[PDB]
From a paper:
The approach of [name]-37 is substantially different from those of the other interface antibodies, as it engages HA with a distinctive antigen-combining site. HCDR3 has displaced LCDR2 and flanking parts of framework regions 2 and 3 from their positions in the IGVκ1-39 antibody complexes, creating an intertwined paratope. Contacts with HA are nearly all through HCDR3, LCDR1, LCDR3, and light chain framework 3. The combined breadth of the subject 8 antibodies, without an IGκV1-39 representative, covered 10 of the 12 HA serotypes, demonstrating that polyclonality and diverse V(D)J gene usage can achieve broad reactivity.
Residue numbers in the entry:
A (entry chain A): 44 to 308
B (entry chain C): 4 to 139, 145 to 225
C (entry chain B): 1 to 211
Write the structure that this text describes.
C-alpha cells in the first residue's frame, strides 16, 4: 500500500479530535478544553494548532504522562473530598480566564494561606477501589520572595507526595521567568499512580497545587497520534497520521506510526 | 527608527578583560529587559546573560557565569557586559537584544544589536595587503585580493558604494600562516573598462587599515 | 536546563513550496517557542511577529505551532530570499536555550558557471608571492570541482577556496579558488590553467593564461 485517502475515518474506531487542545491541557482542565471532561477514545488526535491558554506550566516527564492517559483512553475524573483545613482553596488567576472571570485548571486546587497561617498539610487517601488511580498535582514557583510570602506565609515551602511504594519530594524554585499572560511565575506538574490497597499521602508545607480527585486507568488498548489530517465520515480499520488506509495489501510505506489492524512495514 | 548600537569589541589576549556597550535609542530603555547573545564561528546562537529593566535582577549562562558581568545604566540608555578571564572559546560575535512584551505575554527578542566581534588569541593584528585582479568574453570580471590579515573581519565596497550590482565578496580562508585572505570580485560590462574607474574600498578595523586600491586593466 | 533538538539540520526546498521545521524539548512546556531568521552578515530577526505586526496588520507568512514537546515552524510559501539558518528558542525558563539551527537552502533550476582566471598583480610579485585566483560566478547547485594545472601538471595542496552564501535574488552561488606559490616557483612556469567541473557544463571548461 502506498496511497492514503487523506482523511481519518471516524469508524469503526472511536476518534476524539483534540482541535485547539493537547491531551495534557484536557487532562489538567484548561478552560478552552472543558468540553473534553470525562471523554473516551480509541485514538485521540492531537493537532499542530493546539496551544495552551491557561497558567504557564511544565511537566518534567511529559512524554510518559501523555502515554499513560493516552492508553487509558478515558479522561474520566472522580472528585474526592480532601480535608484542606486551614487553607484557602480555589485559587484563581487572571492568566486562566473561564467565562469572563479569573479561574484556574478545573482539576487542580491552588491552596493559599488562611489568616496569614498555612500549616503543614497532611492528607491520606486510601484508594479502596479495584483499579489504578492517577492523581495529578503541581508545585507553584513564585516569582519573588515577596510573592512566596504573600501567597503562603512560608519562605521555604516543601511538598512530599508519598505512597507505600513511591515517594516524590519537590522544592519550589523562586525566580523571575518570561511573562506568560502577564505571569512571571510557573508551575511544575507531577503525577502519582496509587494502586488498589495502597494509600496516597501528601505532606505539603507550602506552594502545593492540590489535586481534586483521580482519573481511572483503563486497559491500554487506546493510544494517541499526532496528525493534522481531517476527521472524515468513512470506515477504515487502519489509521496513519497521513490518513486512514486500507488493510488489504500485506505491506505499506506511508508511515511507520499506525493504529489498529495495519499492513506490516 | 529603533536602534541598538554596539561597541567595545576587538582583539584581546587570553585571560585579559574587555567591556561591551549596547547604546539604545528610539525606544524607552527603562522598560525593556536586555540580553547578551553570541554565536561562535561555526556555531549557533548562545544566550549569555540578561538584566531586568529595574536592574539588580540578573542571571547568567553556565558557560560564562563567574567571569562575565551584565549591568545597566538607564540614564545613558546603554547596556554593559564586563568580560573577564577570557578564553579561546569566548571568541564570537556578541549581540544585544531587548525582550518584546506586548500586552502581558513575552514574544521573543525583536530588536537586535548590529554585532560586535571579540577575538581571544595570542596573536597580534596585521593589516591586509590589497592587490588588484585586473581583467584580461563579452563580459569582463575584476576584483581585489585582500591577502594576509588578522583578525576578522574586513569590509569591501566598490566605488564607495556606487557599484553594488554584480559584487561577490567571498568568505575568508585561514591559510597555513595563521592569517586570513579573501577576494572580492565584480562583473561589469566589458565595453566600459576605459570609461569607468573601479576602486575597491577595503577596511580593516582591528589594524586601523583602510585602503582604496584602483583596479586598472 | 531546558534543551532543544532541531530537525533537520540542512533543508533544501524548491521555490513556492511549504516547509516545516521541528524542535523538540527535553521537558514538556505549555509556552510556545520563538523562532528566528539568521541571514548571512545580518543580525537575526524575530520571525513570528516581525516588524510591528502586533500593533499594525496581523497578516504574516511565518507560522509557529506546537504545544508540549513537539513544536513547529511553518513557511506558507517558500521564496528565493528565504535563505537563512533558522533557530528556535524556548522562553519558559532561564537559561534561554536555542537549537542547532536549520539552514534552509532555496533551490533553483540548474545554472552554468562563468569562469574567469586572474594573473598575479605586479605589486604582489615584488613582495615574493604569487596568487592566481579563479572565479566561478553565479552557478547552481553548489557542487563544483576546481582543478589547478601548472604547465599541464596537476596541483594539489597549494590551493584554497571559499563559496559565497546563496544569493537572495537569483538563488545562485559563487566560488573563488586561489593558487599560492612563491615568486621563484611562479616564474619557473608559463602555463597555468583552471579546469572547472560542473553539472550545467556538458564538458569541463578550462580558462588559462600565459607568462
Ligand atoms: C481555535 O483557535 C483558532 C485560532 O485562535 C480560533 O479562530 C479564531 O476564532 C476567533 C473567534 O473567537 C476569531 O476572532 C474573531 O475576530 C473577529 C474580527 O475582529 C471578531 O469580529 C469576532 O467576533 C471574533 O472575535 C479569530 O479571528 C479566529 N482566528 C483564526 C486564525 O481563525 C478558533 O475559533 C478556535 N476554535 C476552533 C474550534 O477552531
Ligand atoms: C493532620 O494533622 C492535623 C494537625 O496537624 C490533624 O488535626 C489534628 O489532629 C489531631 C489528631 O487527631 C487532633 O488531636 C487535633 O484536635 C486536630 N486538630 C488540630 C487543630 O490539631 C489531622 O487530624 C491530621 N490528619 C489526619 C488524617 O488525622
Ligand atoms: C471550591 O470549588 C469547588 C469546585 O469548584 C466547590 O465545590 C467548592 O464549594 C469551592 N469552595 C470551597 C471552599 O471548597
Amino acid at each position: 500500500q502506498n496511497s492514503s485517502i487523506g482523511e481519518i475515518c471516524d469508524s469503526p474506531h472511536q476518534i476524539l479530535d483534540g482541535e485547539n487542545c493537547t491531551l495534557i491541557d484536557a487532562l489538567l482542565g484548561d478552560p478552552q478544553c472543558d468540553g473534553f471532561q470525562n471523554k473516551k477514545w480509541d485514538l485521540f488526535v492531537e493537532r499542530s494548532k493546539a496551544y495552551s491558554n491557561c497558567y504557564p506550566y511544565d511537566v518534567p516527564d511529559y512524554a510518559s504522562l501523555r502515554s499513560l492517559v493516552a492508553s487509558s483512553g478515558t479522561l474520566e475524573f472522580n472528585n474526592e473530598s480532601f480535608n484542606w483545613n486551614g487553607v484557602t482553596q480555589n485559587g484563581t488567576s487572571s492568566a486562566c480566564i473561564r467565562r469572563s472571570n479569573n479561574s484556574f485548571f478545573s482539576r487542580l486546587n491552588w491552596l493559599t494561606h488562611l489568616n496569614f497561617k498555612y500549616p503543614a498539610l497532611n492528607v491520606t487517601m486510601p484508594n479502596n477501589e479495584q483499579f489504578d488511580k492517577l492523581y495529578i498535582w503541581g508545585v507553584h514557583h513564585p516569582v519573588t520572595d515577596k510573592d512566596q510570602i504573600f501567597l503562603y506565609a512560608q519562605p521555604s515551602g516543601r511538598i512530599t507526595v508519598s505512597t507505600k511504594r513511591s515517594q516524590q519530594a519537590v522544592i519550589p524554585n523562586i525566580g523571575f521567568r518570561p511573562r506568560i499572560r502577564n505571569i512571571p511565575s510557573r508551575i511544575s506538574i507531577y503525577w502519582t499512580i496509587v494502586k488498589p490497597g495502597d494509600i496516597l499521602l501528601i505532606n505539603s508545607t507550602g506552594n502545593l497545587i492540590a489535586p481534586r480527585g483521580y482519573f481511572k486507568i483503563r486497559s491500554g488498548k487506546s493510544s494517541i497520534m499526532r496528525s493534522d489530517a481531517p476527521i472524515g465520515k468513512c470506515k477504515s480499520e487502519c489509521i496513519t497520521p497521513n490518513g486512514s488506509i486500507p488493510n488489504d495489501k500485506p505491506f505499506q510505506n506511508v508511515n511507520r506510526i499506525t493504529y489498529g489492524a495495519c499492513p506490516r512495514y | 527608527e529603533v536602534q541598538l548600537v554596539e561597541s567595545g569589541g576587538g582583539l584581546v589576549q587570553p585571560g585579559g578583560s574587555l567591556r561591551l556597550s549596547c547604546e539604545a535609542s528610539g525606544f524607552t530603555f527603562s522598560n525593556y529587559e536586555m540580553n547578551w547573545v553570541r554565536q561562535a564561528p561555526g556555531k549557533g546562537l548562545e544566550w549569555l546573560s540578561y538584566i531586568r529593566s529595574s536592574g539588580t535582577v540578573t542571571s547568567y549562562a553556565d558557560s560564562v557565569k563567574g567571569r562575565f558581568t551584565i549591568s545597566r545604566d538607564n540614564a545613558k540608555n546603554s547596556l554593559y557586559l564586563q568580560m573577564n578571564s577570557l578564553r579561546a572559546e569566548d571568541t564570537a560575535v556578541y549581540y544585544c537584544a531587548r525582550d518584546l512584551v506586548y500586552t502581558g505575554s513575552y514574544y521573543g527578542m525583536d530588536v537586535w544589536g548590529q554585532g560586535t566581534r571579540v577575538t581571544v588569541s595570542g596573536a597580534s593584528t596585521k593589516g591586509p595587503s590589497v592587490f588588484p585582479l585586473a581583467p584580461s568574453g563579452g563580459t569582463a570580471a575584476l576584483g581585489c585580493l585582500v591577502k594576509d590579515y588578522f583578525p576578522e573581519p574586513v569590509t569591501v565596497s566598490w566605488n564607495s558604494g556606487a557599484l553594488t550590482s554584480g559584487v561577490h565578496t567571498f568568505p575568508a580562508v585561514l591559510q597555513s600562516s595563521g592569517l586570513y585572505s579573501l577576494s572580492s570580485v565584480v562583473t561589469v560590462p566589458s565595453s566600459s573598462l576605459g570609461t569607468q574607474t573601479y576602486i575597491c574600498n577595503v577596511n580593516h578595523k582591528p589594524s586601523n587599515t583602510k585602503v582604496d586600491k584602483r583596479v586598472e586593466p | 536546563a531546558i534543551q532543544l533538538t532541531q530537525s533537520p539540520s540542512s533543508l533544501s526546498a524548491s521555490v513556492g513550496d511549504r516547509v516545516t521545521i521541528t524542535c523538540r524539548t527535553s521537558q514538556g512546556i505549555s509556552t510556545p517557542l520563538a523562532w528566528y531568521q539568521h541571514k548571512p552578515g545580518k543580525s537575526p530577526k524575530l520571525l513570528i511577529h516581525d516588524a510591528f505586526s502586533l500593533e499594525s496588520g496581523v497578516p504574516s507568512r511565518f507560522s509557529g505551532s506546537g504545544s508540549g514537546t513537539d513544536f513547529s515552524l511553518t513557511i506558507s510559501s517558500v521564496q528565493p530570499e528565504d535563505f537563512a539558518t533558522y533557530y528556535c528558542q524556548q522562553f519558559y525558563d532561564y537559561p534561554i536555550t536555542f537549537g542547532q539551527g536549520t539552514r534552509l537552502e532555496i533551490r533553483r533550476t540548474v545554472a552554468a558557471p562563468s569562469v574567469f582566471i586572474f594573473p598575479p598583480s605586479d605589486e604582489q610579485l615584488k613582495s615574493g608571492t604569487a596568487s592566481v585566483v579563479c572565479l566561478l560566478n553565479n552557478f547552481y547547485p553548489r557542487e563544483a570541482k576546481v582543478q589547478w594545472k601548472v604547465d599541464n601538471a596537476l596541483q594539489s595542496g597549494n590551493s584554497q577556496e571559499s563559496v559565497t552564501e546563496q544569493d537572495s535574488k537569483d538563488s545562485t552561488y559563487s566560488l573563488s579558488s586561489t593558487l599560492t606559490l612563491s615568486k621563484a616557483d611562479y616564474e619557473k612556469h608559463k602555463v597555468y590553467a583552471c579546469e572547472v567541473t560542473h553539472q550545467g557544463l556538458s564538458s569541463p571548461v578550462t580558462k588559462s593564461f600565459n607568462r
